[PDB]
């Protein structure tokens, strides 16, 4: 019992609960016992029939039991490099989309400044540009001394003027 429990929750780099390492072990044993009796690899639907459970769960457990690999094992037939040299860092900044984002921000500032200042501020705090949080209408009213219906109307004015092709063409290109 102690050995099995320890091998269950301690022998894996990605720890797996015993309750379902049990079913991985049982799936493996039944598939390799049926393989020799039938002569072929057991299709997961037949394995599910032996499971009394849905096959999709069988594929899920099959892909769960797969263990991680090492980043530093030599990958070539000849020993010259490791696996980790060929993995791209996804989290790294593209260094191209950053400049694009900055220029898009500049274009947005120019477009908003072209619009009337009240509308620009309304939309800026509506979508939370200058700050971290977009705000609801009542905040806009409390900061501009107007009712929320008036803010809805000025927002209607904003996207109405923003559909103007002068801004529409100059901004739609940025995609």
């Amino acid at each position: 019992q102690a050995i099995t429990r320890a091998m269950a929750d301690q022998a894996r780099t990605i720890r797996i609960p015993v309750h379902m390492v049990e079913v991985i072990n049982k799936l493996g044993r039944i598939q390799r016992e049926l393989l020799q009796d039938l002569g072929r690899e057991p299709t997961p639907e037949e394995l599910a029939k032996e499971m009394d459970i849905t096959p999709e769960k069988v594929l899920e457990i099959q892909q769960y039991a797969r263990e991680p690999i090492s980043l530093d094992q030599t990958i070539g037939d000849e020993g010259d490099s490791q696996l980790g040299d060929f993995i791209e860092d996804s989290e790294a900044v593209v260094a191209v989309d950053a400049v694009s984002f900055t220029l898009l921000q500049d274009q947005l500032q120019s477009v908003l400044d072209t619009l009337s200042e009240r509308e620009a501020g309304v939309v800026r705090l509506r979508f939370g540009l200058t700050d971290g949080q977009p705000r609801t209408l009542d905040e806009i009213g409390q900061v501009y001394g107007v009712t929320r219906e008036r803010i809805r109307q000025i927002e209607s004015k904003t996207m109405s003027k923003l559909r103007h092709p002068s801004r529409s063409q100059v901004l739609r290109d940025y995609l």
């Binding site: 991680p68 690999i69 090492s70």
Partner: protein, 195 residues
Amino acid sequence: KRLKVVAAFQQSGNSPMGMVLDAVPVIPPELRPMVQLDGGRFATSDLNDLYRRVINRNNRLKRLIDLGAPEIIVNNEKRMLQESVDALFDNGRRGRPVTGPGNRPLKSLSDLLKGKQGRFRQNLLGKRVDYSGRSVIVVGPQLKLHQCGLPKLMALELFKPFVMKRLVDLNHAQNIKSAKRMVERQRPQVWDVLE
């Protein structure tokens, strides 16, 4: 020979207590990445395995001490802890190296700082650089001594931001994204500004 280290421990204000170790540091996770490859397969730097071994041995020793066990088992666990820290700091220095899957020695901290493949002479002294290319050479007998030929495609790829700016300024592309699209599509106007 003894004085060579004794005098160093004397005149320098560091206690030799640091020779023995009872609290082991843990490298940042991003320096020992666990990343999912395309296909669901997972990769690790073998450091997670050694750290896991250290953690397992330490926890089991804690359990043995708290529970109360005959001194033989406690001594065996302490020896395993010592050998696990041994493997973590320098695998294969003492005894046979700690081996994982595929029957290969595991890369400890020391092996990450040794030889050609170590950090010092592979990433610090010489680095892979951007804005560079490589191609076959062909004799250029009509060139001048200070000149050299350059393939058009390689020159375009190298001077990408340069032609990007120089063409978005000449109003060929309205914005930077359009300039990138022209460059990747290799529009005819690109070559003139490239030259």
